[PDB]
Amino acid sequence: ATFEIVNRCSYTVWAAASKGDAALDAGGRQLNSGESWTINVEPGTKGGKIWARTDCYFDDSGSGICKTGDCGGLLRCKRFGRPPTTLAEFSLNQYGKDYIDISNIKGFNVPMDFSPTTRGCRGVRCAADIVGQCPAKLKAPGGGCNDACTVFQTSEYCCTTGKCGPTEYSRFFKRLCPDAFSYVLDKPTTVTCPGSSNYRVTFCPTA
Template sequence: MVPGGGRQLDRGQSWPINVNPGTTGGRVRARTGCSFDGNGNGHCQTGDCGGKLACTAYGSPPNTLAEFALNQFQNLDFIDISLVDGFNVPMDFSPTSGCSRGIRCTADIVGQCPNELKAPGGCNNPCTVFKTNEYCCNSGSCGPTNYSRFFKERCPDAYSYPKDDQTSTFTCPGGTNYKVTFCP
């Protein structure tokens, strides 16, 4: 989440995050292949946060993101799983109360990643690799590509490119509680 935090979680561990009142949004991501010293300095193979355990910036691609915008239009929360920054771990992003629609992305994207997008520990998004408007949507207009279709076919509910709103954003009533599960 930005601003910051970070904690090593071993298999089966959880980390409750209480979002402060008035928080309007955030991101949760897994980082993999990490090594930190006692001062929280080090690096991660995927999702690195500038060499810090306690993130103060967005993680570097590739990383699977759970994104949320709280108490927005008509007191709704907007949630999504985004693969726009690539993919590093399967994820489930689900409400724990007050709403029934969760989102999952559990495909073997790393194992099936196109050669051009392969990265150590993950699968990059095409914008990171090619840096063109076709993939990055810098001009505001872009559509699906063969690469975004690769992600969408495997995780139909997840964002596959920056303008993939219609099939990738879900709503719950404001005040809903959520959980993010890595490698469900």
């Protein structure tokens, strides 16, 4: 499956792609404003994620740091990134279908659209100014808007027991972005696509 990753932000981002225990394609790359990077993701990939990292520095060996979404200091991510990170999430070729969503469960850093480039399903988008409107207690000093689990580490926010409800904090994310997951047990906003669809992830789709 091909994913074209497009940076429409006015600032540079460092795209990342991982399934948690391995890189997808090269795992990461710098995208200047306007740049597009196309990666290939193996069919059957379960629990894949794509995200943006901001304010990164890497040396010539590809080691460094990012202010949001850092994946163990690597340019080429092999693991998931440090919150806050808006997440494009996907599982491919699962009994004949693909499943896609956007999630704010790990917070929000950069607005995103995640859409198929092939027929048979709709895209999803979370492009509101979540960082600008972020509740004081969730603001990440390093940049972005943290999820409540990251900030407070309670069973209720982290849904540790599989029993949790919406919260004042989850409702903030849901109000700004109805089409993204706002907490673990949120009413799903997952889209079912034909198996083996192709996709485009666009950062800052409306600006």
